[PDB]
Amino acid sequence: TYDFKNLPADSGAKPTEDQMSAVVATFVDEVALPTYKDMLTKMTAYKNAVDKFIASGSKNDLADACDAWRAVRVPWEQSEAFLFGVADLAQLDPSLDSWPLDKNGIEEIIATGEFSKISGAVDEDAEDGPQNLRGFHTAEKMLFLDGEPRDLETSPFAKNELEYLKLVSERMLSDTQDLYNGWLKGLGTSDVPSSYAEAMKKHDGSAYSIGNVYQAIELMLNGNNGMAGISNEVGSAKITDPVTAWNGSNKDATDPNNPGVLAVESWYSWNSLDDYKNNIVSIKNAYFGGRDLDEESASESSLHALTKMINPTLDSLMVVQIDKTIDAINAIGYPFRNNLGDTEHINTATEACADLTTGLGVVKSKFT
Numbered sequence: 125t126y127d128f129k130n131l132p133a134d135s136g137a138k139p140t141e142d143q144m145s146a147v148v149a150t151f152v153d154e155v156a157l158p159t160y161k162d163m164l165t166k167m168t169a170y171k172n173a174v175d176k177f178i179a180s181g182s183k184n185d186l187a188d189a190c191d192a193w194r195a196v197r198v199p200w201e202q203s204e205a206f207l208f209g210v211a212d213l214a215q216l217d218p219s220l221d222s223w224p225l226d227k228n229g230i231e232e233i234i235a236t237g238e239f240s241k242i243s244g245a246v247d248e249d250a251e252d253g254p255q256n257l258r259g260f261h262t263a264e265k266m267l268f269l270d271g272e273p274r275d276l277e278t279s280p281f282a283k284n285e286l287e288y289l290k291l292v293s294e295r296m297l298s299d300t301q302d303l304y305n306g307w308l309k310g311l312g313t314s315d316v317p318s319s320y321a322e323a324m325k326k327h328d329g330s331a332y333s334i335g336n337v338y339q340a341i342e343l344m345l346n347g348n349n350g351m352a353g354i355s356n357e358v359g360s361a362k363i364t365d366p367v368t369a370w371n372g373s374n375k376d377a378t379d380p381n382n383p384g385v386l387a388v389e390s391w392y393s394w395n396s397l398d399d400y401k402n403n404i405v406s407i408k409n410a411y412f413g414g415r416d417l418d419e420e421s422a423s424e425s426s427l428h429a430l431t432k433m434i435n436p437t438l439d440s441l442m443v444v445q446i447d448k449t450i451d452a453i454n455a456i457g458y459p460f461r462n463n464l465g466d467t468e469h470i471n472t473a474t475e476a477c478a479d480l481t482t483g484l485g486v487v488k489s490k491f492t
């Protein structure tokens with residue numbers, strides 16, 4: 125009979141500052157920095173694989189580049205529960221991963237070779253802002269066709285499009301380096317002067333307005349770019365918005381202008397459901413205090429432990445809900461671009477994200 129809006133009384137135990145500081149430390153050292161390190165390693169393999177393909181024209185090298193694209197995408201999407209800090213401050217989320225794309229501008233660059241248009245600073249209010257001509261999805265669009273490696277004779281590359289692919293992938297690597305370095309040691313720029321990891325571990329107001337340990341925990345849970353942000357975004361935006369478009373449409377998944385299909389992020393490669401699942405794995409890692417950890421393997425310095433201590437029922441409801449949300453995402457028909465009419469499964473999934481969002485709000489309330 126208990127739910128997130130109808131809880132029993134808290135235990136009365138409140139965590140100490142040293143306890144909360146250890147949760148933040150373990151988050152930074154066992155969730156953030158390793159996710160990003162794994163991303164840098166996988167991004168370097170991805171750029172090397174793309175390069176080897178550009179050099180050869182080999183179908184096997186292409187397949188390998190495609191695999192490498194998917195593999196670097198795991199840790200990136202597993203990092204969306206913590207877009208605060210460098211990802212936010214240095215504009216790297218939109219630089220790396222804008223959707224949708226300015227498809228007319230991409231085609232134009234392929235024709236003219238004006239590659240300078242793709243390497244500028246993020247500018248979110250111009251339609252031809254550079255961010256919308258680069259990133260994961262521009263590479264995707266060139267590597268993949270409806271779920272598969274592109275066919276090199278069915279849809280042949282333009283010479284300029286190959287150079288475009290190389291430039292996009294250089295910049296994907298560069299942004300990833302900046303992300304990991306920004307956390308690890310800082311970039312020495314106006315926006316990211318010093319280590320974000322250190323400013324988070326110290327939480328003493330010396331950098332980035334992280335003023336005390338309560339602010340650091342609130343940051344992890346927050347609704348703009350923390351745990352509640354990504355639960356809410358997966359449910360209300362990534363899943364809901366393409367379904368809304370589909371419902372207003374002709375409901376023909378084979379029509380290249382179907383607005384539902386076109387709104388599905390990673391439909392080129394059919395990576396959408398893996399993305400959404402990985403976004404909730406990001407929450408799960410965050411809550412249990414390590415990559416791929418769960419309740420039965422959780423760190424003692426985790427949000428899980430502190431919530432359990434404050435209210436066992438709320439924690440227990442959170443344990444169930446993280447797993448219910450992942451299971452609901454996984455039960456949606458694959459690929460998502462052909463199953464936008466899979467109503468029952470989609471609804472369980474969007475209701476489960478909406479409930480994980482409420483739950484994370486309640487957890488956050490125990491620290492403000």
Ligand SMILES: [Ca+2]
Pocket residue numbers: 221
């Ligand atoms: Ca994304």
Ligand SMILES: [Ca+2]
Pocket residue numbers: 221
């Ligand atoms: Ca995004």
Ligand SMILES: [Ca+2]
Pocket residue numbers: 222223224
């Ligand atoms: Ca967008």
Ligand SMILES: [Ca+2]
Pocket residue numbers: 247248249250
């Ligand atoms: Ca502007």
Ligand SMILES: [Ca+2]
Pocket residue numbers: 271272
């Ligand atoms: Ca097929």
Ligand SMILES: [Ca+2]
Pocket residue numbers: 272273275
């Ligand atoms: Ca094929």
Ligand SMILES: [Ca+2]
Pocket residue numbers: 275276277278
């Ligand atoms: Ca062929």
Ligand SMILES: [Ca+2]
Pocket residue numbers: 333334335339
């Ligand atoms: Ca603050």
Ligand SMILES: [Ca+2]
Pocket residue numbers: 360361364365
């Ligand atoms: Ca929405």
Ligand SMILES: [Cl-]
Pocket residue numbers: 394395396397398458459460461
């Ligand atoms: Cl999919």
